[PDB]
Amino acid sequence: MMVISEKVRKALNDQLNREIYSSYLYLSMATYFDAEGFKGFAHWMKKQAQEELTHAMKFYEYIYKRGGRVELEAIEKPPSNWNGIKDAFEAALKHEEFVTQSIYNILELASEEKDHATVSFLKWFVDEQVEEEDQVREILDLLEKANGQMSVIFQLDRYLGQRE
Amino acid sequence: MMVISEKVRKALNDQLNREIYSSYLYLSMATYFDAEGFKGFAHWMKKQAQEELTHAMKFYEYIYKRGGRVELEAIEKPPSNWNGIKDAFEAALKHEEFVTQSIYNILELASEEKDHATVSFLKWFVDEQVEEEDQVREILDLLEKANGQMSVIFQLDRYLGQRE
Amino acid sequence: MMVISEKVRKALNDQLNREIYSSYLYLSMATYFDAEGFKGFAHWMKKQAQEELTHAMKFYEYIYKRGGRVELEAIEKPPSNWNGIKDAFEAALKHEEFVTQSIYNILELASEEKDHATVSFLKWFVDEQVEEEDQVREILDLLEKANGQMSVIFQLDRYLGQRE
Amino acid sequence: MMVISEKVRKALNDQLNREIYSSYLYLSMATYFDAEGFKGFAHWMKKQAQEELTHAMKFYEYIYKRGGRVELEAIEKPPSNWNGIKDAFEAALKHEEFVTQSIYNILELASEEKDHATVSFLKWFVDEQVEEEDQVREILDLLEKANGQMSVIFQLDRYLGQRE
Amino acid sequence: MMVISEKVRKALNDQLNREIYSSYLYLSMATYFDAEGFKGFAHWMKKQAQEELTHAMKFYEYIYKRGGRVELEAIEKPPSNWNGIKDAFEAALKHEEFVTQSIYNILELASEEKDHATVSFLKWFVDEQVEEEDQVREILDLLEKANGQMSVIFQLDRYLGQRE
Amino acid sequence: MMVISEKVRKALNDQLNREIYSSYLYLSMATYFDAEGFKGFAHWMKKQAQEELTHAMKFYEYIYKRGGRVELEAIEKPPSNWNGIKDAFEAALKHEEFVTQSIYNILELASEEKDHATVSFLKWFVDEQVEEEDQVREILDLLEKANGQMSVIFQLDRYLGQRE
Ligand SMILES: CCCCCCCCCCCCCCCCCCCC
Ligand SMILES: CCCCCCCCCCCCCCCCCCCC
Ligand SMILES: CCCCCCCCCCCCCCCCCCCC
Ligand SMILES: [Fe+3]
Ligand SMILES: [Fe+3]
Ligand SMILES: [Fe+3]
Ligand SMILES: [Fe+3]
Ligand SMILES: [Fe+3]
Ligand SMILES: [Fe+3]
Known about the structure:
This is part of a larger assembly, with six copies of chain A.
Chain A: H1 6-35, H2 39-65, H3 85-112, H4 116-121, H5 123-146, H6 150-160
Helix pairs in contact in A: 1-2, 1-3, 2-6, 3-5
């Protein structure tokens, strides 16, 4: 029997599908970077897409551990184009902050229901979101300091393509 | 400049999106098996989902090698339930046969345009599809021999749960 | 369900039985060389017989992978005698070319029916036939220069007796 | 010079061709098991086919050691179908006992001619047939206890698929 | 005896000489880059000249395997100068695309004659040409982003100078 | 600034193209040996062809080290046919002696101009030419002792096929 409420279960299932879209969105940024010839930036986004799937699977396993079930929903078409290298990463940061707020909303719902298990489970994502936002802010800061010089952009592309 | 025709490029980009859905469909079959308590079958479907992602990324790589660009499209909601273990694998089998026919159509399109590079590239998927269909047929054959006998179904769940 | 046509399955099953006969034929050439006291040439033919069996088993595996069945047929009695070492290899070259043409006919039949899986599967045998015909031609050209000189035939016997 | 009588050489050459058919017969039993979806039992028959070929090559080497030569004959078409797993292995047992009696006849013929070299050479096959018959009797005994229970047949198939 | 047609042998022999000229052409671009003081770009072209030689030897090997012989023809004088780094690599891309079409013509010729051995042999060059064109397009894209900036050109020179 | 005179650079550039032809000539001798079925002699000529390319690149390096630039010229069609194995190697010897005399002429030209750097650089080729002429003379002496006997020629083919 399910020991999370249907409201909490649906909130968690909604976030799983949101994590799937985040994966799809980052792959779409890879299609943009590859079209612009930045295979290092595209590589960074492909690795980011795979990491987002592990976030989705962590929601997946917790839902079943609490006696629930996952229902996959349609994935909306992501944007394919951005007005430059820095514009894409600014869209990534805005998305991650949106995901952080979505995690907050589940946390507050679970907290009002005294669902301490789900509240505690979400702590990992709260801390992880802090790191996800910082990693994009650092990249954005280096892109701003580059100020469009292919000199620096070439090294940052080579550097981000180095991601394991 | 793109050296594949827009017709061939659209056919390849469509197949990439079909591979993305195939991954999603097998993830949804994993949600079904996990809901039914068969963590070995669910594990098998999760591994199949990741293998379909590598199929999509192969189309991804080739499109850019020929000067094209990938555009990710919306992903339809897959079915979430099946009328049994054998009904799911039968849906998996006919999905894969449909995928083989879709690859066949690109090959014939590429062949009529004398796009030998794409014809040769598609050979790996033709051979791979032979194995994809065969492994599902083997599971269906073992499930039919099982005839819904839990002691045998337990062994196949453990067996498929060992997939690397 | 069989996903190859009955016409193609019979063509593939016929070639399996042809590969079995070729295996048998090379063993019979070994019986001739051993009768003549050339254990190096006989060793080469015994290894060639084993190699043809792996060709037959490759057809075996593909037929079942496509949902078909193998039916073994009677094997004709091969010749037991040849008019010397060079006459045997002249029969071997003529035989390999016959096998190559038999592979060609299956390839063209599968191609007419748009059976791309079988067309792709046969590519391995096409390339292998290039090597097998070349190996016999190399031996025949070296035998032609030998002109029956026993000092050269011994070293070639010792050399071919070293086959892995 | 040949130091075995032509009567003995013919008996040994006939047995060689019998071993070739034995290999072919067990390969045909593999085609039946593979058609029925028991790839473990089919694996057992494919390995058994290889072992019969080593029996043929043992007769091969001895015939030439005694100054004789081998003449390969046509191979009869083996049966392609059996009415069940127990029917196939029971046909295997009766074939092996028929092979044992044929070896007995050579031993008695050779001993009446006081061909002690051939009598002693056949000792290895006499002992080997004891093991060949016993291994089939053991499988038949396990099949009789299984009485068609798929849970038992499944891992008996897996066990015989482990044959080295 | 030659088992490829004279029409196909000449087509293959013509392509071998084409590969020889391409080898010579890339060596000539190295003389240009070295004259301009770019030892990294020159190093890249010297490695490319050697890779083209292995292409020629592959055609060499196959022609003799099919019973033909190679006849070396005169090599035209390649251009010695170019209007810039990007002019050379754009001439390299145009040449490689011309080489691919020459491979396409041989494949279509061989297929019209049902020379399946040559059609299958040429698949390797079809796939290789995809990579040859892709790597030059990548360099052209990096040169376009450099836009003549010596700070960026210095990085691309050292990068291409690291080619093994 | 170029520190060799234009007359010395032209003499060096002419020898570079001469070395390129020497490589091409030995590859042509390989096509003849392969056409005659002597894969050992052909292997020797293929290795010799690769060695001549390193001679050309040595001239390539020295010309640029002295501030000059290389201009590649057209390569004449080499001969494809010889009367026999001993003609090919006798043509190789007289070609190498011609190369030695051409190096002598550059040496005397450079010494007339008191270009001590080029004179000392050429010493390596003077000593190397002694070895190249010697190794061909040894092969010619063994072929003369063979006197067209195929049993001895086969041993020399195998031996020269071992060249590293
Ligand atoms: C090497 C580059 C890899 C890029 C991967 C991009 C993945 C995008 C996925 C979008 C959503 C489609 C459904 C994915 C299901 C994944 C299931 C994983 C189970 C372990
Ligand atoms: C050196 C031995 C050559 C033997 C040639 C025999 C020709 C006729 C053989 C008929 C039966 C062949 C059975 C082959 C079974 C192979 C099983 C392989 C399993 C991986
Ligand atoms: C490192 C620079 C190399 C430049 C090569 C330019 C070649 C131009 C044509 C001259 C003839 C080349 C013959 C090559 C024969 C190679 C044989 C290899 C056998 C494995
Ligand atoms: Fe996330
Ligand atoms: Fe797929
Ligand atoms: Fe064959
Ligand atoms: Fe036996
Ligand atoms: Fe090439
Ligand atoms: Fe030289």
